[PDB]
Amino acid sequence: ISISTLEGHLSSIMIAIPG
Amino acid sequence: KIHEDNQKIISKLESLLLLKGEVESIKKQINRQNISISTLEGHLSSIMIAIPPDLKPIIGRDSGRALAEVLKKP
Amino acid sequence: KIHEDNQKIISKLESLLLLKGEVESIKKQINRQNISISTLEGHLSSIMIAIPGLGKD
Amino acid sequence: KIHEDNQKIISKLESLLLLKGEVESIKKQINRQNISISTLEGHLSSIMIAIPGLGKDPNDPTADVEINPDLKPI
Secondary structure (H helix, E strand, O other), rough: OHHHHHHHHHHHHHHHHHH | OOOHHHHHHHHHHHHHHHHHHHHHHHHHHHHHHHHHHHHHHHHHHHEEEOOOOOEEEEEEEOOOHHHHHOOOOO | HHHHHHHHHHHHHHHHHHHHHHHHHHHHHHHHHHHHHHHHHHHHHHHHOOOOEEEEO | OOOHHHHHHHHHHHHHHOOHHHHHHHHHHHHHHHHHHHHHHHHHHHHHOOOOOOOOOOOOOOHOOOOOEEEEOO
């Protein structure tokens, strides 16, 4: 559960797909 | 008396064989964790870029708006 | 009858001996995911923050 | 034959009693896992609050402070 909530935060925060 | 003790042993052994569904339930939990980690590694792999060797990822302020100004145009 | 009951006990002991390899496979899978969490912690520790040129509004 | 059967049962039971130290090893790996998860939570907490707009609606993440510095205007 802790990783799943950590995944939900890290999705919108980190990705901008630069490549 | 020995037969009574043997039936008691078999009775406790059936309880110890009940743990197989519990171990498979653990295996599904680690499998769910493995999917969550793999999505995280997929997300961190996209933001990683080279720095003018080191491969340091860069985060932006709002939606990667600063990433267009700083980085070299390809 | 007693000897037949003990052969049933050993058969259930053999099934529990099969359960040990499944437990050890769980331990190896916990170890592999723990190495994965360590290296993503490494990639999060090395990260750059970018600040834009103009405030949008 | 029954006594020889009991020695086989005891010997296989001792092979099953070797597994308790392995379960204790599962406990140490799970403890080391949640320290690593806590470090990941600590890193993402510092990033999302230093960088604006990345709260994901927690109702102003910089405003998580307790409010009683003898203020009471209300």
